[PDB]
Design a protein around this nucleic acid. Structure first.
Lengths: 272, 272, 272, 272, 272, 272, 272
DNA sequence: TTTTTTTTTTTTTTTTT
């Protein structure tokens, strides 16, 4: 009276691919109600969801969720196209750089930073990128005792608040080049972080490592060599976002299709 | 077995719009009594009510109950228009601002602050609007530990007590500008907030942020540009309020039928 | 197995209007001991009592089950009128004020404050009134920063002894004129005190406010404008009172049988 | 099912001489093992004992179950007569005083205080009184935060050592005066102490009131008009006392037989 | 069958000389095997042993294990007699004092403080006297946070190292003077104490009181007027002692056979 | 079914060398779905895996898995061989030292301290060795309360970052050299550590002991006497990894085949 | 039901001499997994382990493990002869002293101490003696707050470090001197140690007693004239230790079969 | 046919400190 129920729940979770609570809430609430009525023991469903998430992360990496199964159709049918056109950035070169940074094959280069206002198509694009990947780590400096937290076995590490802290410079340097390092999470819990691309959204400077109560500038060369900086100037307009999933999938497919040459230096010569 | 019963209970809770035990006892009390008699474990009904509320907050909006299916076909039939012409404000402009702040037709601008003593009738209108929306929250800024405690998955955010706190200004600005944000809630909870229309009612100026024990003024530019400020000079009569749901529905219908353009401004003009 | 028992208990609690376990223990004993022997958890009885209290307070009021249909059949059949005449107060004016306080509709005026001897035959009357009505909030000075704690969901509120504090003055000011305001309570919790008619018994200067460690007289004009002062001087005999439900019902009936105009004012002039 | 067992247990606790854990263990020893074997849950027996104690303390006074139906025949039959002769008290006068103090007919003169060493025989009398009635309150002033700890819902209270503070003098004045009032007990809670007759046995002056950090005796007129003081002089002999129960019942019956006039003051006429 | 099994277990624990778990397993071993074969939860045997111990402590007392079963009438039949003769004490007077202190015929005086080395027979004799009785208390003054530990109704209260703390001296005085008292136990436990004979075995002056972190002699007069003094100025030979049950039985028999007079004062006045 | 399923799970854990949950998930993935479809009870599988891990840690060691099963084939063409040849380290001497430190043949010399930059290649080799073996401890120094982590019974104890502490220097010395000491974990329980080969990797000065809140070098003689210090300064190229289990097995087999008389000494000499 | 399982567990624990879960898993792991799969409750196993420990400690001592069960007739051949020749003491005299200390026939003389540098054959012999007997206490001085914590009802008290404290001097005197005494350990816990053999492993200032917050030698005589003290100088080699059980058994048999004269004195002559 | 409760494992604290 429990084996078949657990099997059906695991099958439904694998067929739907749930990652949180509101998702399954707006999806199909009949299975959840049936499970709650049959037994309030949420341990089984929690373990099943954890196993499903682990299998999806360790197997379905970032590119696995980037290559759209449908045809690319056209690149002009996405808001990112006109956004970059108004901002002024190379589409093919930017797509190639993003692919190289997400594939982790570049080596010590695995981090992108943006400098400019948030109204220039930054917050919307960051939210769209975070919502695209099903497993993403939203790291925030809400707890100074442990900065890095939700970012173990994920796909994209979002940095929308503050900058890189100085108390965990080793972890940041290891993640910049796709490496790993044992970092502490909550109270008594040291775990290793796997190679996961990081994207910044905060309107600050990634090089400005916050230490104690000021900024430190001692390892600017490695931070610049392991991170690609994109300057922002010309702001956007009104209602210049609303990035969906089909547009991102088509953009990723187009980027994977045509690939150009990419360098491996800080001073990126954007001239594709 | 219990799956059908749980599905029926969820459907009933969704169609009844229950928000707590009081509403459940007022509406259908037989189901609650039967569930309590069959088993004291209120975990099932609690989870069902939570899921129903989350679904209603993520799907239900304003036209579901704020806009009536049939308009009033007149103007001299509801005390709302009487109180409006007594206070002295633009009817079409006010309706447009209300529809833009509730239905969300722009983005940043998504807040309203109507100041008025306990005699101009604004308090009665605010209480009626709060009672209309069952899934609303009276986020009272009295407790200096967790202010935002009634704005997560709600219909309206009533601000009738207290001004603003300087400790959490980012979350307030994000809620005013229609977007998500993280608030330092409990020790093991801090999710985002869904874009919910916020209406102010306290006589104290909400723009004056309260920091610990002092008042700030530099943080007034965004608080003023992300909302519409209105003032009520003339009072009312002998108990003129207690607006019901039919009156609000008729007013919303009349607005949707007759609405001009919407302007982006903070200081209300002397017209209307 | 227990649905019938739960429904019977709920019906009995709604009929007898029981609010505490002591009342039910004193009244029905067969069903009580039967439920105790059956279910070893008081969750059912607690839920039944909560539902009964909600239906009696939120939906119902007090005079509905307080104004007995059996008139007094004469001018004065007890000693309440004799005590009132010995104290020195307006007859028709006092009756009108009492009817307005019981019904609540004569503007914001809905509170009485007594002052005089510490035993002017009022303690026994207050105790009898509290014992008769099933819903009564006894405001005690147990808490330091949160003195007001027995005013949410109640028919009448009684102020024992001690001067009003300054930590929660807005709640009292709102309850005086029927308004409401959300204030904090224990540790990490804020609620809105439901407006309820309040009566003060402490002869001390209740108009004064205890602010931290001083006596402020600022909150005096609104308190006097929203309340009626009763200056007590001449006391009664030895425990002159013994008010019962029948006496209160007869008084309410004889007062409703003859209603006159009301003179809203703070100073209750004894002469004329 | 368990209704019959619960009814039998209640009847036993009522008319079997069971009031505490030790008393119940000494009464029916096999009943405890039988109840433990029939059910491993002591909640039923705990609730039964609580209900029995409440019914015996609240509604049930004390003399009704401590006044034998047979006279004392001759006053020279117990050690109480010798103690009274050695101390100095009028037979009929003391009997009438005790009757009035136990019946609470004076309205406010329901208090007794003794001013004499422990060697006079006060300790033995207090021990006999405590052993007689099964229930009794024991107020210990060892902790200022919890003055009245053992006296809620009782018939006779015994003041061991220590004096009464000045933080809750109103509670003591209402208890000794034949009234009631909320009193702060443990867990920052407020309990109710009905007019329970109290008797003091310590040798220290009980008139001293500890207010904050001083000793004041302002409460003199009420303490004299609501209590009766008795000064002791002569002591007793080595190994004397050990008052039983039948002797107390016979003495109470003899006192009830001869009832005369009782004065109204603090210093009772020490004569006869 | 539960009641019959409980009664059989109680009878076995009573007629097998069982105190709890240690002695229960020492005397018999098949009881646990039978219990495991019948049931599994040790709560049954725990409650059985608790009830057996409570009954043994209530009914029987000290004399239950003092007088032997077979008369002997001889002073050279035990080692305690030779020890007391070598130390310099009258055998008849010592036996009379022991017989008078065992039954507690004096009342006020029921304690004797012994101060002397261990080679003369102090710690060994104390441990033998403590183990002679099945239920005994060990109020070892080792933790300032725990005044009286094991001593809730016992036959003999053995005191080893440590002195009474200036905070619960009244409880010790009442226990020594044949009376009860309430002493705080653990964080959530506190029971009274029954008048049980107490014997000290401190190597120093036990009359001293431990006040906070110093020594004070405030309660020395009561301890001197209610307790005798014993000094061990001599020393016995090596390889001696062993106070079995037959020795104590013969000693008590000889004491009861030879009864004289006992004096009451500070020092030990061996006059009889 | 329960016993058979538990036995099958234990056998699978012993065969596949399961240690954690994610490992078994990635390994025998069909077993998880089979157990979910058969029943719902993760406690059984958790206990089985815990018992299997405990057995493997208490019975197995390092040489049980370090020994290969076929010829080493490569002698100096592999990546590790090329790195060792370019670093100027003795191949045979290094292999003999590793065999003596892992196989426990040295006994008194079972500690290695690698000092130098991070790009030398020691960090990557240590991480690969830790990830290859199943059970392994990560004794880090992130908190000042838990000096050790999961080192109790393991194959290799990797010291990523941090330095030795002072509150428990005996435990660290016993874990490194191979002594004994009863370590005390939290305030609940504790346990010792089994002689497991420890390998250090932190580039910081490991000899710097953290005493309270300062740096002390008093506990350096034990390390100098029972530990070889190797200065790893010669950096490598740019991410030179690609380490498998077959290569490590071949290297261990070649080392075992080429073993002579290892020279014991703190500072590394020119014997290469 | 569980009678057969309990009997089987008791028989296995008595046969294999199991003293904990580790020993049970090492001797017979099949029954452990069988019981874990056929029953989740551990009450039966806990009771069996407690009974085994009681039977092995209470009804045992030191000499019980002296004369081995297998004759070997070994004298000078194992590492014991080498350690004796390196320490500089008479083998026959040392064996006789060890036998006398294990049998406890010298009254106060019941302890052995051996001073030396560090790894001078003392730690090896200490660890061998600790691992020989399956039941013993490891009174580690890692927590000076509770020294004598794990040694109650044991066979050998191992002292691998720390020094002698003044807070538990009575227990140490009773153990080394052969007596019994109760001492308070943790919060609400008293332990009584019996005359149990003690073996020291460290070479610290054992004579210096830690009193309050400093060192004192007040117990010079009680700590000197109560045990046999010896001095060492010549150390050993590397990997030349780890005394097994066969050598210890042979030495014990040789000492039991070869007994000479033992002089009662602390300052033992250098060379028996 | 016939039930329908074996303990359904009815669900569990606050603690573990």
């Amino acid at each position: 009276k429990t084996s078949a129920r657990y099997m059906e729940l695991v099958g439904w979770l694998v067929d739907k691919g749930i990652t949180s609570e509101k998702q399954w809430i707006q999806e199909d609430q009949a299975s959840y109600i049936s499970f709650n009525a049959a037994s309030n023991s949420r341990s089984q469903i929690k373990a099943a969801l954890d196993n499903a998430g682990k299998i999806m992360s360790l197997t379905k990496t970032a590119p696995d969720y980037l290559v759209g199964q449908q045809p690319v159709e056209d690149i002009s049918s996405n808001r990112i196209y006109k956004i970059l056109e108004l901002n002024g950035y190379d589409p093919q070169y930017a797509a190639s750089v993003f692919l190289g940074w997400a594939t982790k094959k570049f080596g010590k280069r695995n981090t992108i930073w943006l400098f400019g206002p948030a109204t220039t198509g930054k917050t919307n694009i960051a939210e769209a990128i975070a919502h695209t990947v099903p497993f993403y780590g939203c790291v925030n400096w809400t707890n100074e005792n442990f900065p890095f937290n939700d970012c173990v076995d994920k796909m994209v590490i979002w940095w929308e608040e503050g900058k890189m802290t100085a108390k965990v410079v080793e972890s940041a340097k290891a993640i910049l080049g796709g490496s790993k390092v044992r970092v502490d999470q909550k109270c008594k819990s040291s775990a290793q972080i796997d190679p996961t691309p990081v994207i910044v959204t905060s309107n600050t400077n990634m090089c400005a490592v916050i230490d104690g109560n000021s900024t430190t500038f001692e390892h600017q060369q490695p931070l610049q060599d392991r991170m690609f900086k994109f300057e922002l100037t010309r702001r956007l307009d009104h209602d210049f976002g609303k990035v969906t999933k089909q547009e991102v999938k088509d953009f990723f497919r187009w980027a994977k299709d045509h690939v150009v040459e990419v360098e491996h230096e800080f001073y990126v010569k954007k001239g594709g």
